[PDB]
Amino acid sequence: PEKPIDREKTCPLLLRVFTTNNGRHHRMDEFSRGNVPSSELQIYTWMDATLKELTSLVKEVYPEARKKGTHFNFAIVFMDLKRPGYRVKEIGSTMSGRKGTDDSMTLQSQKFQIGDYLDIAITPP
Amino acid sequence: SMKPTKVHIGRLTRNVTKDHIMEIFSTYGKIKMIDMPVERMHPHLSKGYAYVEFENPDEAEKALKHMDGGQIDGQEITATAVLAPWPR
């Protein structure tokens, strides 16, 4: 059971996004103690944002990523109090110019909690 | 019989800082004290709540009026009056 989100009535959440261009996600040691990697991209969005929607915002910031065939691998980076540290969990991928089965995956469907980081490993075609 | 001046703010996202809380709730009155505890084993992170004490009960009432059910960083928050001395 999910609540529909009215984006004029619900204020957006701050999403802190990190990207690579070599197909590999950031190491966990780059996030220790509140440090973060270079090139943070700050997005304001909603819990029903989809991978396809987020991909277009990323393409807005990096036009080279627009090229047909570009692969976006999405991972959530999140503090797990159970282990004393950050963990990364890959959630899905999209590709420029292709319709894939993760296009419509949403943050909340993945149990994303606000404040968790998004890490996007991008592979040129 | 005297009315409370201290409020508990709940459901704060992991993005929300002590300064954000000062800035937002100062909208409703003069803040005399804030307590926003951090994760013991990860001090850079809050526990997701704060106490805010105002100078007078009218201000605390106002804050509760406007923000219990209000939103901070895209998430609905709780605001409730608290009658207790600071923790020991």
């Binding site: 701050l14 304001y44 | 909208t27 219990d68």
Partner: peptide
């Protein structure tokens, strides 16, 4: 448009917030 709809902090990183509508408080 976001800045018309929602309040934004000066403190960083900047976050948006929003109190209950006058409507909602009375109701």
């Amino acid at each position: 448009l976001l800045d018309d709809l929602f309040r934004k902090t000066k403190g960083t990183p900047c976050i948006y917030w929003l109190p209950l509508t006058p409507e909602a408080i009375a109701e």
